[PDB]
Symmetry: C3
Subunit: 320 residues, 3 copies
């Protein structure tokens, strides 16, 4: 008859383990993000084989755009080009783009890595180098890598503040991430201060374990997962988040798969009543706020059906 | 034997009410938003202690950007600054920025509220006021509040149209918000017209109960929740949405937590072959369309398992 | 006694097919999209009744913006206007905008289709036509349709690459779309190459079944659904996606419902120290990546409860 008891204990254990007496529903989320911290740039780069110095200050209206769909981007490196205008000009001489005669390359060709429409006419590029030029924005951008020192090497010193508002539509519950009367100043830590949401990017990378400068050179994507494990029962009610970080990139390191994160952006203006654009190749770190969770409440129907299921189980256990 | 009959009524009630004979699956959504209504601005503001008049017209391409990830933003108030250019200039004199001696403040300091890198050199700012200047965009913006009258005071007269398309991947079902042959002209009302989705922002606030001007001055976030309670059974088939609204903000009213919604935006240009930006501090209302819902079809497996698990409930009650 | 066996066969069939021994949990996703392929524009349009020629090249930084919240936009057609500036100017002559006397139209009117604030003063517009002018951007844009040939007629020749990274929070599992050591060069096909994610816009339209030119003229929204049916049990483990394509639009073709996809964009500049904006009316194809899927692992509790539920189901059928 002791066996008749043991299953009962197991049953209770199972219930207490997973709250089968709790109708559970998914989560609806709203995220608001504020990034603060100014950056100083001062370094020496090279363009067209000529050295130049770049200096300036970025004031959080310059190196990012407002949050849109749970993803706020943070600039870390750039390659500049100015004076682009519509015309014909020789393309950056590569193996596929080199020629000695106009008949070498065909007009209208669209090489995947070429940024201009080819007219099939080989012309001298520079110092007796011959390539068949393209009709595009000119002068053509030189395809190189981002400068080895981080142009915004002070990126990890920034601070991001996150306000998360969760609501469950089944139950009548909506609550925020920050409760009234909380510590304003913070620096998020796993154990020292695990609740206030002020994140330092250096802290994020230290938790992840990667080198911030290396992935900042080529850009990358990561995510700040927010876990809401809330119980709505009055007897034991607690609804508090847990923060985790994870690198969302793959570290492919293959040229064909576009390693890291980067894009191209254009600024237009009028010079001498002529349209002229300047091109910025931006490498950055893209943060995602992946908030997920479940919320449940005591419900009679789930308890009844689970008891009905367990009844036959222990009846059979007694039978055999 | 009546006790053997009350369980039948209870089980039928539960099965009919919660629809246990249905395979409930989540929802996949697509949202498309169009905002229409022009606005006129005409007011008197003050900059550097001098009064100026601002007037103009915004044409639904000037005060918003296209929908991106279920969130379309609407401008409400702005603070302007022009002639920004790289240099060194005294910071806006506050308690943490004032100084009387050169050694008063240290070079390289980055105050959280200061927008420039501090070089630690106390210089006269204006009428014998001394602060240690910063090397940044100049002249420095004056941190003030948004003007008490709403610069976009005619914001609540706008009209927003929402087209929602839901698909369930389990079942072969996809349907839209607007059925063919429906009233074009509308103004959404709780009871007068509860289905056509033309929303007025003033009505949006009126349903919530908050004053439009107060939230508009400092900005805020609210949600337009769309609830799809659809049943796919042929006998009782109805799939129509219900519209609800809520304020997603917190009303913190604390300076340290950045009350309301605002951001900073820049427009670059060339003046005398010199880079010059102009800065806009934007306060606005960011709308979110938080769509959720469930749907299910009749399934033999769910009905069979529920019947098998509910049989023991009366099988035992007969014994006792 | 065979009836005792048919129920066992049915139970085993249901358990194997629908996987009752699994703890099914939702999916968390991250998407990274790269669009490549240059476009050339060369055509003849008409503005103000005068013919003009438009030519140029778009280089994947001109006709799109970076991915933001699972939606990347692609240019396909545009209408240009330049020289806009704040002032008073006659509105485009329509039925609601025409007048013969000043008292005919009342000041302050806001017609839904009018883009300017009306001052109620009938003035000559062009060759003895009379309309009451509006205080707005000038000269007023002429409301027309997009040019019948596709300005971005080569749009279907572009290539889009998609990197999807999924994680399940319940189990300790995260995986990406592309496995190491895969074919780089690709063109997606239903049967020839169904796994590598390089998509051609012409290919996806062909799979959908609609012509590219007609949809591109007025714009539309379609989704790239990615389905992850992953099983985490070690015995039979396979986590590979299935690609499906669908058109998210409605084909309303009604003027009041804004058929197709389009918006208005502005570029600002300074000419003769006067602010002057230029307006672009954009018709484009907005792509969505609607990712969804489920995954689960072997769990003792689900197996136990399902057996306890089916025990009564077979026991009662044994009785009768
Ligand atoms: C890419 C983000 C910032 C971008 C950038 C990059 C390099 C620069 O120096 C070379 C810039 O000038 C100083 C800027 C200016 N901003 C303004 C904010 C901004 C916002 C954007 C964007 C680009 C920019 C560039 O794409 C969509 O949303
Ligand atoms: C912030 C939204 C509108 C912005 C703005 C603010 C103040 C102004 O008075 C000087 C503006 O001129 C009339 C404009 C013009 N637009 C164009 C649309 C637009 C779109 C944006 C944006 C800013 C703007 C500014 O940030 C990302 O997406
Ligand atoms: C609307 C997308 C592209 C837009 C456009 C339209 C017409 C043009 O001439 C015909 C343009 O010049 C070549 C451009 C340039 N870009 C840069 C990228 C871009 C990005 C955007 C945007 C507009 C543009 C315009 O709205 C928010 O995000
Ligand atoms: C409710 C609250 O914030 N209490 C205290 C606050 O008074 C104090 O300034 C801060 C110092 O870190 O610690 C916390
Ligand atoms: C199918 C349909 O739209 N029917 C009518 C429409 O004819 C009428 O113009 C409108 C007036 O509000 O009411 C509705
Ligand atoms: C692992 C791998 O990619 N193997 C081959 C690759 O070597 C080859 O270049 C390609 C040709 O399409 O087919 C594949
Ligand atoms: C970050 O800030 C700390 C102190 O504020 C400073 O010591 C450190 O050098 C900074 N790092 C960078 C990369 O600017
Ligand atoms: C909104 O519009 C109504 C009528 O169109 C007008 O009476 C009212 O004054 C307007 N409100 C604002 C703030 O412009
Ligand atoms: C697309 O490309 C193919 C081959 O690259 C070419 O034959 C075809 O004409 C192109 N279509 C357009 C519209 O440019």
């Amino acid at each position: 008859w002791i066996f008749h008891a043991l299953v009962f204990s197991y049953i209770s254990f199972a219930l207490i383990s997973d709250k089968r007496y709790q109708k559970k529903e998914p989560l609806i989320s709203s995220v608001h993000t504020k990034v603060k911290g100014i950056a100083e740039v001062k370094a020496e780069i090279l363009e067209n084989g000529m050295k130049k110095m770049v200096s300036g200050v970025f004031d959080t209206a310059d190196y990012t755009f407002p949050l849109q769909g749970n993803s706020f981007f943070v600039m870390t490196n750039f390659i500049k080009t100015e004076g682009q205008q519509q015309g014909l000009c020789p393309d950056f001489p590569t193996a596929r783009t080199i020629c000695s005669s106009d008949r070498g390359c065909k007009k209208g060709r669209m090489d995947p890595q070429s940024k201009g429409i080819q007219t099939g006419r080989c012309v001298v590029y520079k110092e007796r180098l011959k390539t068949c030029e393209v009709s595009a924005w000119c002068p053509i951008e030189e395809v190189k890598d981002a400068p080895r020192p981080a142009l915004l090497n002070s990126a990890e010193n920034f601070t991001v503040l996150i306000k998360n508002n969760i609501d469950f539509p089944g139950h009548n519950y909506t609550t925020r991430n920050i409760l009234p009367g909380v510590n304003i100043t913070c620096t998020f830590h796993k154990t020292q201060n695990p609740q206030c949401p002020i994140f330092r990017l250096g802290d994020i990378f230290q938790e992840t374990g990667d080198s911030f400068s290396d992935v900042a050179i080529q850009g990358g994507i990561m995510g700040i997962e927010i876990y809401w494990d809330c119980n709505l029962d009055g007897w034991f009610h607690h609804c508090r988040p847990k923060y985790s970080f994870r690198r969302l990139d793959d570290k492919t390191t293959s040229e064909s798969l576009y390693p890291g994160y980067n894009f191209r952006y254009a600024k237009y203006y009028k010079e001498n009543n002529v349209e002229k654009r300047t091109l910025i190749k931006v490498f950055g770190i893209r943060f995602d706020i992946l908030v997920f969770g479940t919320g449940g409440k005591f419900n009679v129907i789930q308890l009844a059906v689970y008891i009905g299921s367990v009844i036959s189980y222990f009846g059979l256990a007694t039978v055999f």
